Amino acid sequence: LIVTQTMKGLDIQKVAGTWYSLAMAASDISLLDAQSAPLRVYVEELKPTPEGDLEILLQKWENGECAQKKIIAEKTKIPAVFKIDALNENKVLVLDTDYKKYLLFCMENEQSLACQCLVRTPEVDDEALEKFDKALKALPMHIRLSFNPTQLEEQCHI
Amino acid sequence: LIVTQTMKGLDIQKVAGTWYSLAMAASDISLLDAQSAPLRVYVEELKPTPEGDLEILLQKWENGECAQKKIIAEKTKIPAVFKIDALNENKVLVLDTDYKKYLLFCMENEQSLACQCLVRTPEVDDEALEKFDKALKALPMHIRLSFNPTQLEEQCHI
Numbered sequence A, B: 001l002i003v004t005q006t007m008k009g010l011d012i013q014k015v016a017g018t019w020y021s022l023a024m025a026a027s028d029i030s031l032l033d034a035q036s037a038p039l040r041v042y043v044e045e046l047k048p049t050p051e052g053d054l055e056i057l058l059q060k061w062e063n064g065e066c067a068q069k070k071i072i073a074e075k076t077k078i079p080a081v082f083k084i085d086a087l088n089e090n091k092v093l094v095l096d097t098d099y100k101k102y103l104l105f106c107m108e109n110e111q112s113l114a115c116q117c118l119v120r121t122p123e124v125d126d127e128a129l130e131k132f133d134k135a136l137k138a139l140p141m142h143i144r145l146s147f148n149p150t151q152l153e154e155q156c157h158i
């Protein structure tokens, strides 16, 4: 693996609801560079299932347009780690959250990697961004993006 | 203006020679996002003139290819500030350099802005990157990119 920061005592039910992708970082530039880059995904809502799986609603630019997407992250034996199914095993880790303001996560498959700082409101949270940059110093990131409140209220952060 | 960090006692003649754009940051995502983004420029060599102007040799992706470019930054009454001529006055500021290892600069024209961390060798200089991130905390950056030694040895950081 690469990420080695997870949240202890995570209650997944408590991450339900509205989120904003305030910032994103990735191990490779091409993961985040254009609007249609593979990991350029904007989180809209987290919906944990009664069984403790996590449905994710996001927006993604595909074929010159901002498309909705609904994804399932299946629980593992580790509360802070989930699995999306693909041609390749892709792992979601929750690094840190306070439920009410911010949540940091990374997704990972040379191993590749993207992380975001999620926030509850269309506001620049300097404190959440601090924690995001601290978490990222452990990691081989090569691109970082952040969004302003105006963009945060547009579909696909236009 | 926006940038408010310049190097005191700058000797421009001493920045002559080979440089590598190790990292870049900008105030707007669209300034750096694709390979043909307007401020995605890779520095190759600095050539200060006897009169104290600064010629810059760089590479830039334009029309699906990595083109060379030669640019003149004309001196001002301030040693650490130079001017490129365009439809709009565009200002180059030297923030910090030690001549032998690293140099930080910003270019600026809502005012927009891009900065790079230049290094003498195709090596990841953690120390130069520290200084770059410190300088950038004063600034409204929204995209940051960094390159690995393999890319640093390819034209247009391929």
Ligand SMILES: CCCCCCCCCCCCCC(=O)O
Binding pocket: A015, A038, A039, A041, A043, A056, A060, A069, A071, A092, A093, A094, A103, A105, A107
């Ligand atoms: C607890 C935070 C969980 C957020 C997880 C976001 C995972 C989305 C990854 C989807 C990858 C790109 C989308 C796709 O093309 O399928």
Ligand SMILES: CCCCCCCCCCCCCC(=O)O
Binding pocket: B015, B038, B039, B041, B043, B056, B060, B069, B071, B092, B093, B094, B103, B105, B107
């Ligand atoms: C002392 C460091 C000076 C480095 C200055 C680099 C200035 C290059 C800016 C050129 C902007 C894009 C190129 C172009 O399209 O003309």
